[PDB]
């Protein structure tokens, strides 16, 4: 689990753009206020190789 990828973002990267921000993604009708919750998720995932 020492390797990760980003599953969620506001928009696609431009070519050679890079992003290490950890803002919670709002997936739907309820805003997140800086924490995970109902319709609210941390943007990174791990492969578990």
């Amino acid at each position: 689990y020492n390797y990760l990828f980003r599953l969620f973002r506001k928009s696609n990267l431009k070519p050679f753009e890079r992003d290490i921000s950890t803002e919670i993604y709002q997936a739907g009708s309820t805003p997140c206020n800086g924490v995970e919750g109902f319709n609210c998720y941390f943007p990174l995932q791990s492969y578990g190789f």
């Binding site: 431009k14 070519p15 050679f16 753009e17 890079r18 992003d19 290490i20 921000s21």
Partner: protein, 110 residues
């Protein structure tokens, strides 16, 4: 003496700092605790080191490269920008990778 570029300018996400100190130019991309309101006296991922004076600069940010052009000239009518033509020539082409949307300049103060 220099400029700051980024989105937030708060080190929760990345920003580009450029500073001149008369002996050198110093350039950084970082997320350390910088100034609350930037000035000078009279968590990193890139780093580099090198009114009669009209100094002119151009900045642009394309496909992860940040590009700088400049020119220096005297101006005998010092009061405002001169009416004649002159061309700026390239300085540097930096692989900094930031989504820049906002910027600020840096001043020496008492």
């Amino acid at each position: 003496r220099g400029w700051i570029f980024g989105t937030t300018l708060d080190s929760k996400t990345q920003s580009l700092l450029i500073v001149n100190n008369a002996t050198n130019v110093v350039i950084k991309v970082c997320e350390f605790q910088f100034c609350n309101d930037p000035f000078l006296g009279v968590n990193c991922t890139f780093e580099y080191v090198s009114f009669k004076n009209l100094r002119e600069f151009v900045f642009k940010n394309i496909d992860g490269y940040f590009k700088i052009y400049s020119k220096h000239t005297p101006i005998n009518l010092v009061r405002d920008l001169p009416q004649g033509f002159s061309a700026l020539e390239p300085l540097v082409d930096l692989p900094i990778g930031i989504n820049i949307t906002r910027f600020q300049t840096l001043l020496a103060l008492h």
